[PDB]
Amino acid sequence: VQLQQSGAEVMKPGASVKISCKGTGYTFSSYWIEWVKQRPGHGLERIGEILPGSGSTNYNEKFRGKATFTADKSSKTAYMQLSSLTSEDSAVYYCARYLPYYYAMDYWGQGTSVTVSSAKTTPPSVYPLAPGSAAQTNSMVTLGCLVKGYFPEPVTVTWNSGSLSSGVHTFPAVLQSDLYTLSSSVTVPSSTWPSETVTCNVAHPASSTKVDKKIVPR
Amino acid sequence: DVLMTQTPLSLPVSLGDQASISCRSSQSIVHSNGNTYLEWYLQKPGQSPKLLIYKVSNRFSGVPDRFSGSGSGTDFTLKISRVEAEDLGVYYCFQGSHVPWTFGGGTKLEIKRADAAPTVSIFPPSSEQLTSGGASVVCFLNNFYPKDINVKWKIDGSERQNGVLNSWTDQDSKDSTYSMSSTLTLTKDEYERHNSYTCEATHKTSTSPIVKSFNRNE
Amino acid sequence: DRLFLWIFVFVCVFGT
Amino acid sequence: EKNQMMTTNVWVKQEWHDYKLRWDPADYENVTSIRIPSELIWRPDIVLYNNADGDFAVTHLTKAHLFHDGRVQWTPPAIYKSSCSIDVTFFPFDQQNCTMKFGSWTYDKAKIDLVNMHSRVDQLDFWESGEWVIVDAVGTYNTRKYECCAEIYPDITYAFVIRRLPLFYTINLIIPCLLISCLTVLVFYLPSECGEKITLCISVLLSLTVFLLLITEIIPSTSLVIPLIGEYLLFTMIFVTLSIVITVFVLNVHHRSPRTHTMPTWVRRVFLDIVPRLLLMKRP
Amino acid sequence: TDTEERLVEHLLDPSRYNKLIRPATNGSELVTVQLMVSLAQLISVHEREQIMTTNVWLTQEWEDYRLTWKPEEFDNMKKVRLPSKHIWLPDVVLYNNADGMYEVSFYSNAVVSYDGSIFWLPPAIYKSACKIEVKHFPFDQQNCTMKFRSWTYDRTEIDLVLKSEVASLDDFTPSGEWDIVALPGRRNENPDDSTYVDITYDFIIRRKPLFYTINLIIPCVLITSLAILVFYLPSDCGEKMTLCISVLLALTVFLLLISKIVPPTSLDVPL
Amino acid sequence: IPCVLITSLAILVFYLPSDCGEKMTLCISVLLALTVFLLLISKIVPPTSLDVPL
Amino acid sequence: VWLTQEWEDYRLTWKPEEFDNMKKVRLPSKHIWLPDVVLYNNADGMYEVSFYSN
Ligand SMILES: *[C@@H]1O[C@H](CO)[C@@H](O[C@@H]2O[C@H](CO)[C@@H](O[C@@H]3O[C@H](CO)[C@@H](O)[C@H](O[C@H]4O[C@H](CO)[C@@H](O)[C@H](O)[C@@H]4O)[C@@H]3O)[C@H](O)[C@H]2NC(C)=O)[C@H](O)[C@H]1NC(C)=O
Ligand SMILES: *[C@@H]1O[C@H](CO)[C@@H](O)[C@H](O)[C@H]1NC(C)=O
Ligand SMILES: *[C@@H]1O[C@H](CO)[C@@H](O)[C@H](O)[C@H]1NC(C)=O
Ligand SMILES: CC(=O)OCC[N+](C)(C)C
């Protein structure tokens, strides 16, 4: 069996989005479809369920009136339509099988990330950083690579053909006011930093952008 | 809606240790037929959840035998005999007895080990930042443990809280440590007016906060 | 009958 | 309406061609058509899909009319008990829509195809009932695919729109209920010294409850919609129960004396100065 | 067509086809029958006599080596429709029926593939006895089962098999009084018998309570709320007896009606 | 249980004062309720004359 | 009910070795001699069994 969900979405606040879950390899009409919301922060929340066979649907108190379930029997697809969107609705939505009181929710969808924001597509703005001038130089020193003013996710940062993969600590993106960013620092020997060349890459498949800015000593 | 509470919110336990997660219900979730419909789901990072235990006395197919469960009408617990690296993730308790059905709060699982001191670093802006007209100040803390970490943006005798970013990294695999990259975005009109920039960070390993600072005047 | 009114109100409340 | 079934007496007119049952009337004394038992020849297996406590297929098996050019005409009778969802929001002024779905059971569209003999159900020999009127009865041709089978199966679905004639239930339920409802407010104009307020309000409540129960023996036990008459009866029952509570309270207030009660000053002021004046009722 | 009628005559020729003999070769091999229930409507649940009425399509599939032919010898025909009354059938019946109607309603044709595969999908109106749980009426949830067995051949001759783990709802019409929850099927054997096999379907159904709430529960609460008023009624009005006797009458009537609807049996009494 | 409850009220009429003006209501109601239950029981049992239910 | 019935019909014997060691077969009850055993004290006038199985 297999549950296939629709692709990622990006909608402005106040709009409505309809994401679909399509199942195959089993009797679609005889299994409930459970909808689960996972806010990026933490926690799993059950929006509700629908039985495609009949029209029966259930909703959690927190989502009553916010979401509506519909199912198509000809094509093995179930839809969830989200009402007026807000920034709080940005999360990953999962669809899963379920037969109450018997074998329960053993197959899940891939996940359909939804982003709500008024911003538009923006390419990365990588600003490489180097150790401060006023700082003692020891055997070990970190590196600096920054990306900011980009939208939407994801952005991949790597070195020159993976020159130095291990020892890096890439951090999750965060919003300042309207756009995301990213940070990544890696440690290289002080005898290698000025001698060997180290650079961080940036890739924005959504914006079809790729940048390569080397960092040099101050 | 029946509310389900999980304790502890986190459970650091080294490899091979006994792990106990308890889920408690706001009401009895026993069913007439004789079975109690409680389920435990594990979601490793970047993956959809998986079914581990259903009808706690029972267990799903394809899961290691170490997992087990037990409980009564209102108290339930899950036990892991021997913990391993692949067992890291988040565990949720799901009740399938009273409509609507609700998930648990989620109990993240960590592996404990010898705590290591942070390797703090501060990176001033770059030339491209000056040309653009910004001031990207980033403070780095790499390979530290445990989460008892706090960073303070003390600048030239003044502590700045507005515009302070928080972003840490999940426990790694090779090192099983944490990291964090807080930033303070400044403007050219204000970046030059101040002289001394310091990043005060405190950790359990070294009770006295570690100091790393530089001065603009050079 | 006031005493019995008290008693019956109590029992009717418990009937909930 | 209670069991959501419709019983009809119909003639299932069928007509097809058989290539083997052909002859030249010149070779048989100008015999142009015969009548033969319908069980000696091939027939289509048309069945009622939404059967409910009836027969899925035709069982009488009357004789078929066979013509010399191969045409076969078969018009057997059938009694059908189909399922149809009943809507009683406006009962007894309600209009129902009961459908009948007919199709071949084991032949797909590539082997047997249906043709509307006529869009409108024939009513030239209809026997009027006196309870319903057939507003409209049209057959629609549909094709759809089932999970059993890889081929398309056609069907003709007949939608019977029937309107109830309301006089009977009007007289026997609606107007008695209105007459009872006319009495729900009288208890407040009855003097407290008559000693008959409780009789009146209790009788009204019990009669309303009996009529609600009588109504419940007709309508289907479905939770999708609530009849308007049922809602009106329930709300009238609630307000009559409230009036009984108020009547007990008023009777208690009326029989009060200085030997058992003291009148608060605020009670005196309110109910002897303001409310009497607001109601346009002035003490002597 | 001439070829089709030639093939039909050849396949059903009673000289070389006996419909009363199991199509088992090699001596004492078993015939596997695939089974699958499809629900079209839940016509009614009658709590009083504990009977469920359903309109189901009972898919049956098996192999008959005597109904084989070579397509090249018959104009390249791949399948044919044979009347199910003139071929061997597995006597699969609803074993836990009520009123004694074991069999199917229609007896449609069977679709026969050239390789010998039989496909049979006859409609049926079934009545099955199921225990009713009245304790939580009108918020009750029933568990009514359908048991399917061959009453002629034991497990040594035909083995029943489930085509799917659930009953199908691909062509269902929603009830309007009962909500469908789950329709799982299971294949059962008896470890102490060795000749017993059946396939059972559980219909977990949930009652939609609005109708009986509005029409029974609220009036009951209204009448119960008047039970206390008698003690606030002054003794001078001369109406205490009327009130209390009328309340007792109404309560007795409602008890009798509810008992007519949902009988209190020994195991459980409705709350 | 309904029959026992009704029959327990048979003697109450003799403790009811003549001034309350409600003896007839109680005794008539008791009689009619008993008659109704007797009729219901008659509907339940077969209409045979070999013996009377206790 | 199931009305279990058993008797001997000497005319329905065979040697198993001549028939591939078959020990029993199913014959349609309509085609063999049956003892016509029925319920005499029935009401509604139904005497025989429901299906006439093998
Ligand atoms: C609807 O009614 C049907 C019929 O009554 C009912 O089916 C029964 O369900 C029970 C519960 O699952 C079955 O009993 C179980 O059978 C399994 C299979 O062998 C056993 O493994 C079970 O024992 C284990 O599990 C128990 C619970 O975890 C433990 O307590 C026990 O110690 C074992 O670990 C248990 O015996 C029973 O076999 C079926 N009966 C039939 C005829 O199918 C169904 O459950 C009802 N459904 C609802 C929703 O009410
Ligand atoms: C044959 O009979 C029909 C009546 O069915 C008549 O109309 C027709 O003229 C006749 N023809 C001949 C040649 O007798
Ligand atoms: C009656 O119902 C059928 C099927 O639901 C629908 O096609 C038709 O439009 C309906 N007619 C009316 C008048 O409601
Ligand atoms: C082939 C066969 O028996 O089909 C029956 C079901 N139907 C009418 C939906 C196709």
Side-chain angles (χ1 to χ4, degrees):
Chain A
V1 303
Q2 185 213 319
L3 293 161
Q4 183 74 30
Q5 296 199 242
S6 79
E9 306 279 71
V10 183
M11 316 305 201
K12 297 234 164 185
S16 66
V17 63
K18 191 144 73 61
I19 51 163
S20 66
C21 172
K22 166 159 167 48
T24 54
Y26 69 100
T27 317
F28 180 68
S29 45
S30 296
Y31 281 84
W32 296 77
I33 294 282
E34 309 282 323
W35 290 98
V36 181
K37 176 191 178 182
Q38 182 179 252
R39 193 182 71 251
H42 54 308
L44 282 178
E45 301 176 278
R46 199 186 79 81
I47 309 182
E49 56 170 344
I50 179 160
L51 188 45
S54 45
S56 189
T57 52
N58 284 122
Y59 304 91
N60 278 52
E61 281 305 8
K62 184 177 195 265
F63 296 88
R64 213 154 302 171
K66 178 68 197 300
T68 292
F69 300 133
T70 70
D72 166 31
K73 260 146 71 153
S74 65
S75 52
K76 316 315 200 203
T77 297
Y79 304 98
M80 186 182 45
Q81 166 149 327
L82 288 155
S83 181
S84 58
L85 292 166
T86 72
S87 72
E88 181 36 30
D89 300 356
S90 288
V92 178
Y93 295 83
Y94 294 100
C95 83
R97 223 172 54 171
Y98 194 62
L99 194 64
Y101 310 136
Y102 300 85
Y103 48 90
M105 207 149 53
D106 46 358
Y107 289 94
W108 292 68
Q110 65 183 357
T112 286
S113 73
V114 167
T115 303
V116 192
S117 169
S118 316
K120 292 155 291 314
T121 179
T122 310
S125 62
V126 67
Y127 297 147
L129 260 67
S133 43
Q136 59 267 8
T137 314
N138 46 291
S139 66
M140 282 325 317
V141 68
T142 65
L143 266 296
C145 184
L146 282 71
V147 190
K148 69 184 288 297
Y150 75 89
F151 180 99
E153 283 77 0
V155 299
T156 316
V157 295
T158 61
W159 271 245
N160 311 331
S161 52
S163 67
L164 190 149
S165 293
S166 188
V168 65
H169 278 112
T170 189
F171 300 86
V174 174
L175 288 172
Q176 291 96 2
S177 63
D178 213 18
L179 303 172
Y180 302 93
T181 176
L182 190 137
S183 315
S184 176
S185 70
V186 63
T187 61
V188 306
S190 176
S191 68
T192 304
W193 156 62
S195 84
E196 191 46 13
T197 288
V198 300
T199 301
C200 60
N201 301 115
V202 177
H204 202 149
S207 303
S208 295
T209 310
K210 196 265 184 179
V211 182
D212 215 318
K213 294 184 182 181
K214 180 172 155 178
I215 190 72
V216 296
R218 256 69 173 277
Chain B
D1 308 342
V2 171
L3 183 61
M4 294 177 71
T5 72
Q6 280 189 345
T7 77
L9 196 143
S10 188
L11 186 66
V13 291
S14 171
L15 190 143
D17 187 64
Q18 193 64 237
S20 179
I21 306 98
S22 88
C23 182
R24 176 167 294 93
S25 50
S26 158
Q27 326 176 20
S28 86
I29 65 178
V30 68
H31 205 67
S32 312
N33 70 354
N35 296 356
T36 192
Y37 301 112
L38 185 72
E39 292 154 59
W40 290 94
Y41 294 94
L42 169 57
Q43 184 186 193
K44 282 130 65 182
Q47 303 293 50
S48 67
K50 291 188 288 296
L51 177 70
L52 288 173
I53 306 293
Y54 66 89
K55 289 184 308 175
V56 295
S57 164
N58 316 119
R59 162 164 73 248
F60 195 49
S61 71
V63 55
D65 203 351
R66 47 171 153 274
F67 298 89
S68 69
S70 64
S72 302
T74 186
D75 187 83
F76 310 85
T77 66
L78 185 150
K79 314 293 280 295
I80 303 94
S81 178
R82 284 181 330 300
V83 175
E84 290 82 9
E86 55 79 20
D87 201 10
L88 274 287
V90 193
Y91 293 70
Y92 303 78
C93 52
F94 182 87
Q95 65 92 2
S97 295
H98 292 279
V99 181
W101 307 302
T102 65
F103 275 98
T107 288
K108 186 177 279 288
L109 187 153
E110 293 83 3
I111 48 167
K112 190 259 177 182
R113 46 157 271 286
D115 52 352
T119 78
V120 58
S121 308
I122 187 77
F123 273 44
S126 65
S127 290
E128 277 87 353
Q129 207 88 49
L130 279 72
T131 60
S132 290
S136 46
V137 180
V138 298
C139 198
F140 280 106
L141 299 89
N142 304 111
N143 297 291
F144 78 92
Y145 183 106
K147 308 312 303 310
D148 191 1
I149 193 80
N150 175 289
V151 171
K152 183 148 278 182
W153 266 122
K154 190 73 175 288
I155 49 161
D156 57 52
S158 169
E159 182 285 300
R160 172 142 170 206
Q161 202 61 24
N162 64 88
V164 170
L165 285 190
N166 181 359
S167 68
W168 60 88
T169 304
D170 289 347
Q171 169 172 121
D172 300 334
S173 82
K174 66 184 184 290
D175 64 62
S176 177
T177 69
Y178 293 84
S179 291
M180 201 285 308
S181 68
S182 169
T183 77
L184 185 50
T185 305
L186 277 70
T187 64
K188 307 316 301 174
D189 306 87
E190 190 276 331
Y191 163 65
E192 286 283 20
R193 318 192 301 93
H194 282 338
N195 169 32
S196 179
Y197 297 160
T198 303
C199 184
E200 294 294 328
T202 189
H203 188 244
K204 183 188 284 188
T205 44
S206 43
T207 74
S208 58
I210 191 166
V211 299
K212 294 296 291 296
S213 198
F214 70 108
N215 298 323
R216 178 65 183 86
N217 292 116
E218 193 87 51
Chain C
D1 63 358
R2 172 56 54 79
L3 156 64
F4 275 102
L5 171 66
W6 271 39
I7 290 168
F8 270 54
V9 162
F10 274 6
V11 167
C12 175
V13 167
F14 291 167
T16 63
Chain D
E1 305 90 352
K2 189 61 169 171
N3 301 320
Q4 319 201 75
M5 269 161 217
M6 173 180 95
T7 318
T8 53
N9 200 341
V10 297
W11 294 87
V12 189
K13 309 186 285 189
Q14 297 165 72
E15 183 178 1
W16 66 95
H17 271 83
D18 195 316
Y19 66 96
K20 283 288 287 300
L21 306 165
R22 291 190 313 188
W23 73 90
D24 178 37
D27 308 337
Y28 299 95
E29 296 294 89
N30 185 9
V31 160
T32 44
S33 76
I34 47 175
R35 318 264 183 168
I36 49 171
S38 48
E39 52 256 55
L40 298 178
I41 52 159
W42 180 93
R43 311 187 309 282
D45 55 342
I46 314 293
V47 307
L48 180 74
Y49 275 59
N50 52 328
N51 175 40
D53 198 22
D55 304 90
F56 274 101
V58 167
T59 56
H60 268 293
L61 305 189
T62 67
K63 301 176 133 178
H65 204 173
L66 163 59
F67 294 86
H68 75 91
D69 66 340
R71 211 171 80 233
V72 181
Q73 269 181 22
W74 192 38
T75 306
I79 303 284
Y80 284 124
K81 303 194 178 56
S82 48
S83 295
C84 64
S85 59
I86 301 284
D87 191 355
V88 298
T89 309
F90 306 102
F91 166 89
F93 301 79
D94 53 308
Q95 174 177 106
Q96 302 303 335
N97 183 350
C98 290
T99 78
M100 275 153 81
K101 190 191 174 187
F102 284 98
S104 190
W105 196 252
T106 53
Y107 289 100
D108 56 284
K109 190 171 181 293
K111 307 194 172 299
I112 289 171
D113 202 1
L114 304 176
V115 187
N116 289 318
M117 189 177 273
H118 37 80
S119 53
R120 200 145 290 291
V121 174
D122 170 68
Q123 308 170 33
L124 276 170
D125 308 335
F126 190 49
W127 182 292
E128 299 292 358
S129 44
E131 193 176 1
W132 306 83
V133 297
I134 300 187
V135 176
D136 184 11
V138 180
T140 304
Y141 169 87
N142 313 115
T143 78
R144 64 151 301 190
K145 183 179 176 303
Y146 301 84
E147 279 290 291
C148 72
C149 305
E151 312 92 2
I152 310 305
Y153 281 76
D155 64 280
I156 300 175
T157 302
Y158 287 91
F160 289 85
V161 184
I162 49 169
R163 183 174 54 76
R164 193 198 305 268
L165 302 171
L167 184 64
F168 177 80
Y169 277 123
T170 294
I171 297 169
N172 293 298
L173 292 169
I174 297 300
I175 313 178
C177 283
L178 298 182
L179 292 178
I180 301 299
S181 294
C182 279
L183 316 171
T184 58
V185 305
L186 292 177
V187 75
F188 295 116
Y189 197 59
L190 214 52
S192 297
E193 304 96 314
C194 81
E196 294 277 272
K197 315 187 81 152
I198 292 294
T199 291
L200 180 58
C201 52
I202 284 284
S203 300
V204 169
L205 179 68
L206 293 185
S207 314
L208 286 176
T209 298
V210 160
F211 265 109
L212 181 68
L213 294 169
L214 284 173
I215 296 277
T216 289
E217 291 298 273
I218 297 158
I219 66 178
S221 296
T222 52
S223 306
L224 269 285
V225 297
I226 312 166
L228 283 176
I229 186 68
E231 272 170 347
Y232 173 82
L233 279 167
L234 187 74
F235 274 81
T236 315
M237 283 166 59
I238 289 159
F239 272 87
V240 169
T241 303
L242 183 63
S243 82
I244 289 162
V245 170
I246 291 154
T247 289
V248 170
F249 173 65
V250 162
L251 271 167
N252 192 287
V253 160
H254 172 271
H255 283 97
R256 277 174 178 167
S257 173
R259 291 189 165 261
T260 51
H261 299 76
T262 63
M263 185 179 288
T265 69
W266 77 263
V267 163
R268 176 179 299 278
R269 188 269 298 164
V270 172
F271 290 101
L272 306 189
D273 198 67
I274 293 165
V275 185
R277 194 209 313 112
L278 294 174
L279 298 168
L280 314 166
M281 65 180 288
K282 305 182 196 181
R283 281 191 95 178
Chain E
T1 311
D2 204 71
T3 189
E4 171 166 4
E5 65 183 1
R6 167 160 52 91
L7 173 64
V8 167
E9 286 167 349
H10 168 263
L11 285 175
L12 292 175
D13 186 6
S15 171
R16 62 180 295 275
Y17 189 80
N18 199 355
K19 73 186 182 183
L20 308 154
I21 308 306
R22 209 173 78 258
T25 57
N26 301 331
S28 62
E29 76 197 0
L30 61 83
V31 183
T32 308
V33 192
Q34 277 214 323
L35 208 69
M36 183 278 288
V37 164
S38 184
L39 183 65
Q41 189 162 5
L42 171 64
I43 291 161
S44 75
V45 177
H46 201 177
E47 302 94 339
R48 181 66 178 171
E49 62 262 62
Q50 300 182 331
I51 293 172
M52 196 191 51
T53 311
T54 58
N55 174 13
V56 306
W57 307 347
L58 188 59
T59 306
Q60 299 164 230
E61 286 172 278
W62 70 89
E63 293 179 353
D64 198 320
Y65 80 94
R66 298 168 293 178
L67 299 168
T68 299
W69 76 88
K70 308 174 57 43
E72 67 278 23
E73 290 190 44
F74 285 99
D75 191 271
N76 189 359
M77 273 196 297
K78 295 290 195 295
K79 45 183 67 170
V80 72
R81 265 84 176 163
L82 293 182
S84 63
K85 285 288 196 191
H86 302 110
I87 61 174
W88 178 87
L89 296 169
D91 295 319
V92 170
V93 297
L94 181 67
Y95 212 81
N96 70 315
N97 72 63
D99 83 358
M101 180 55 174
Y102 282 95
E103 298 167 278
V104 299
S105 286
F106 176 32
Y107 278 88
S108 54
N109 288 333
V111 180
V112 180
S113 292
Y114 78 94
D115 61 2
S117 290
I118 317 298
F119 181 82
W120 197 33
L121 186 45
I125 305 289
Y126 276 125
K127 311 218 172 211
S128 44
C130 72
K131 291 177 71 68
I132 300 292
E133 298 294 331
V134 301
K135 182 162 181 296
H136 294 286
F137 169 90
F139 302 80
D140 50 328
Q141 157 175 305
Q142 307 306 333
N143 177 359
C144 297
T145 71
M146 289 217 272
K147 200 149 90 70
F148 286 97
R149 264 200 83 170
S150 176
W151 64 355
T152 298
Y153 304 104
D154 63 3
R155 188 161 92 84
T156 300
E157 284 149 288
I158 80 179
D159 183 28
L160 294 179
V161 166
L162 267 169
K163 189 178 179 178
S164 183
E165 66 277 339
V166 290
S168 191
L169 288 177
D170 296 307
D171 298 296
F172 185 58
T173 307
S175 175
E177 170 175 4
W178 292 94
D179 193 43
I180 295 282
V181 186
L183 312 162
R186 200 174 89 164
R187 177 184 175 281
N188 306 307
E189 292 174 301
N190 194 6
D192 293 349
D193 197 35
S194 82
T195 68
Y196 173 93
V197 68
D198 63 358
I199 286 164
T200 309
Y201 285 91
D202 290 350
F203 297 0
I204 316 304
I205 56 185
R206 189 197 296 129
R207 193 199 293 271
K208 302 174 180 163
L210 182 68
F211 176 88
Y212 275 122
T213 289
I214 292 302
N215 289 118
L216 272 176
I217 304 303
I218 285 165
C220 282
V221 162
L222 290 178
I223 295 288
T224 293
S225 82
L226 302 173
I228 65 169
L229 292 180
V230 73
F231 296 120
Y232 202 59
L233 196 66
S235 300
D236 282 316
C237 80
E239 292 275 39
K240 295 167 103 89
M241 291 296 105
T242 300
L243 185 54
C244 46
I245 287 161
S246 304
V247 174
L248 185 61
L249 182 63
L251 291 175
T252 303
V253 161
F254 266 115
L255 181 76
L256 293 184
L257 305 161
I258 279 175
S259 78
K260 289 175 187 175
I261 288 167
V262 65
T265 51
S266 166
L267 77 165
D268 56 351
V269 182
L271 289 182
Chain F
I1 286 167
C3 288
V4 159
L5 293 174
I6 296 288
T7 290
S8 85
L9 305 167
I11 62 170
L12 287 184
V13 76
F14 292 116
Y15 200 55
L16 206 63
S18 300
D19 272 314
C20 76
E22 268 175 336
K23 296 173 96 85
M24 280 315 89
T25 299
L26 180 55
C27 53
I28 293 155
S29 312
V30 164
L31 180 61
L32 297 179
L34 293 175
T35 300
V36 159
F37 276 106
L38 185 79
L39 294 176
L40 294 176
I41 290 165
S42 69
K43 292 298 181 190
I44 284 160
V45 307
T48 53
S49 305
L50 308 185
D51 55 357
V52 185
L54 285 180
Chain G
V1 304
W2 290 287
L3 196 57
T4 311
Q5 295 171 232
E6 288 159 40
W7 66 93
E8 284 274 344
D9 201 328
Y10 74 94
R11 301 168 295 173
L12 293 167
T13 46
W14 75 86
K15 277 73 69 177
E17 69 274 14
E18 183 178 1
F19 289 100
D20 189 358
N21 268 282
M22 293 177 70
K23 296 276 182 232
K24 43 177 64 173
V25 293
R26 298 185 173 61
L27 294 182
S29 61
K30 288 294 226 193
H31 290 160
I32 55 158
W33 178 89
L34 297 170
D36 295 332
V37 178
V38 301
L39 177 77
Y40 277 2
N41 69 297
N42 70 88
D44 85 349
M46 185 67 207
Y47 287 83
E48 299 174 293
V49 301
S50 293
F51 187 79
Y52 277 82
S53 62
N54 276 351

